[PDB]
Structure 1
Amino acid sequence: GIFPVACADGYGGLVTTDPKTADPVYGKVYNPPKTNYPGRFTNLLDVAEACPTFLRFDDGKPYVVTRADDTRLLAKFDVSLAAKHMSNTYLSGIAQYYTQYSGTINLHFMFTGSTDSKARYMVAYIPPGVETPPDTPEEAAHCIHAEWDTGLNSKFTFSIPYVSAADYAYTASDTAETTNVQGWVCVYQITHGKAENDTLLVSASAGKDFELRLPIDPRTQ
């Protein structure tokens, strides 16, 4: 009364991604349920929302050298997913273990001078291929820009729209072309009020949109 042994012709590989399971052996063992313990989480993303980050400039000093005089240009960095401006960065490491990624990106700003001091600044996006960085607030504005002041607020969070070629992109960058993937998106300012020595901070973080597809080791394990 055998059932037809519809044997397997060549499948069933002991391989990586698999969802197959196993047999408990010294099994049938409880544990005190670990609910109500603090520090629970699931998402690298979501925990990367409430937590901001920092940045870096060649001066190795995380904060921004913030000259306060007739100068107009502040400083210009880049935002890849992997760039000297953004190595030591809670996103990238989490990022660099991936290839596909999508969605908006976050930033922050923290002021330094005494509140009394009036001020002006201007965040500004630049698309990868304008062929020339802007050199004046209003013509910079043509791409993307906004404002704030010392007045009525000190913090701020900003975002660049997830422009790309396709609705996704490569995490690492290529050694087969030239054009920067994003640009040199950075900040302008109107007349400094007064300061003996300012300073600026800046971060990035996950928000409504920071997403990924996935995954492989790059490193030399």
Structure 2
Amino acid sequence: KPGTNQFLTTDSAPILPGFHPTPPIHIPGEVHNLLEICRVETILEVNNLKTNETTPMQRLCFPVSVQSKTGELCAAFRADPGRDGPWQSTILGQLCRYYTQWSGSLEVTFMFAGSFMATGKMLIAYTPPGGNVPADRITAMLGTHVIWDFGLQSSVTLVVPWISNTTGIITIWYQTNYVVPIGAPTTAYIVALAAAQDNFTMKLCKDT
């Protein structure tokens, strides 16, 4: 039949039949699927400005200060792990470059890192793919949003409903101004973590 003496790479006589290899042991911690790796939160790089290239240790967090007025935009970024940008620095974004088609939900967690005596409120709004970035806080409030106050809770998680491979854009607003008593620092930093949900999948193999 046709198709003989051909070397298809994607398809053997042993060289040492008498050899018995070393039996295995119970080294703790084994990965059976790569999905167990893309299910842990990792630090995002939202402060991907062009002036932090010289000192790249400040790109892991974005600041909040008392100088900013109320009802003002703080930060914004898309929610496409494959595309270049903030999602390049996470394990999910790095592993998604080895595959072609991916689908599933996502979750993003923030973590306040200010003083214990600082209180306030921040609004986090996510818009579905297809539309435009909100121009006002009142416009953003009508959509999917989560009100976060760091005076009570220190970390909140926002879950992206569905992504596939015209991308969803997330925003962080200023619900109330940053208040602080006398004798405490006037600046606070926020770190963002991202991870995949229990329905993320990848289909085709590729090479970076």
TM, length-normalised to structure 1: 0.75
* 1:24–1:88 distance in 2 versus 1, CA, 3 Å: same
| Pair 1:50 & 2:37 matched | no
Q: What does the per-residue CA deviation read over 1:168-202, in whole Å, with 9 as the maximum and x for residues that have no partner?
A: 41xxxxxxxxxxx2143121231134240011101
* 1:208–1:141 distance in 2 versus 1, CA, 3 Å: farther
For 1:184, the aligned partner's letter is: I
For 1:34, the aligned partner's letter is: P
2:139 aligned residue: 139
CA RMSD of aligned residues (A): 2.3
2:3 aligned residue: 10
State the distance in 2 between where 1:149 and 1:96 align: 35
2:14 aligned residue: 24
1:186 aligned residue: 171
1:162 aligned residue: 162
- Within 5 Å, give how 1:1-221 maps onto structure 2: 8-10=1-3, 13-18=6-11, 22-57=12-47, 58=49, 59-60=51-52, 61-68=59-66, 69-71=68-70, 72-81=72-81, 82-136=83-137, 138-163=138-163, 168-169=164-165, 181-195=166-180, 196-217=186-207, 219=208
Give the drift of 1:85.
2.2
Tell me if structure 1 keeps the 8 A contact 2:133–2:169: no
Give the drift of 1:162.
1.0
Give the drift of 1:109.
0.8
2:56 aligned residue: none
State the distance in 2 between where 1:78 and 1:93 align: 16
Identity within the alignment, %: 27
TM, length-normalised to structure 2: 0.80
> Which of these two proteins has the greater Rg computed from alpha carbons?
1
State the distance in 2 between where 1:39 and 1:108 align: 26
> Which of the two has greater strand per residue?
2
Q: What does the per-residue CA deviation read over 1:198-217, in whole Å, with 9 as the maximum and x for residues that have no partner?
A: 11101212221222111122
Give the drift of 1:30.
3.2
Q: Name the count of aligned residue pairs.
A: 192
Give the drift of 1:80.
1.6
* Structure 2: runs of 5+ lacking an equivalent: 53-58, 181-185
Tell me if structure 2 keeps the 8 A contact 1:49–1:207: yes
* 1:14–1:62 distance in 2 versus 1, CA, 3 Å: same
* Structure 1: runs of 5+ lacking an equivalent: 1-7, 170-180
